[PDB]
Amino acid sequence: KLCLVCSDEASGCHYGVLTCGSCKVFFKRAVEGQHNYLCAGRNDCIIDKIRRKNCPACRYRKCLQAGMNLE
Amino acid sequence: KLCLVCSDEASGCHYGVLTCGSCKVFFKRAVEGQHNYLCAGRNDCIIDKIRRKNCPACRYRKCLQAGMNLEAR
DNA sequence: CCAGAACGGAGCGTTCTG
DNA sequence: TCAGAACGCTCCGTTCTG
Ligand SMILES: [Zn+2]
Ligand SMILES: [Zn+2]
Ligand SMILES: [Zn+2]
Ligand SMILES: [Zn+2]
Secondary element (H or E) of residue A61: helix A56-65
Contact A55, A47 (CB under 8 A): yes
Closest to B26 in 3D by CA, of B72, B62, B71 = B62
Neighbours of ion ligand 3 (CB under 5 A): B 3, 5-6, 8, 20, 23
Closest to A40 in 3D by CA, of B8, B10, B51, B31 = B51
Listed in sequence order, the residues at least 6 apart from A53 whose beta carbon sits closer than 8 Å to its beta carbon are none
With vertex at residue B68, the alpha carbon angle to CA B21 and CA A40, rounded to the nearest 5 degrees, is: 65
Rounded Cα distance between B60 and B68, Å, is 10
Say yes or no for a CB contact (<8 Å) between A38 and B51: yes
CB atoms within 10 A of CB B61: 19
Please give, one letter per residue, the 3-state secondary structure of chain B.
CECCCCCCECCEEECCEEECHHHHHHHHHHHHCCCCCCCCCCCCCCCCCCCCCCCHHHHHHHHHHHCCCCCCC
Distance in angstroms: CA B55, C1' D9:
20
- Å resolution of this model? 2.0
CB atoms within 10 A of CB B69: 12
Cα distances (angstroms) measured from residue A24 to each of A12, A20, A29, A60, A69: 10, 6, 9, 11, 11
Domain ranges for chain B, please list them.
Answer: 1-73
Rounded Cα distance between B1 and A56, Å, is 31
Method: X-ray
List, in sequence order, every residue forming a beta bridge with B19; answer none if it has no partner: B12
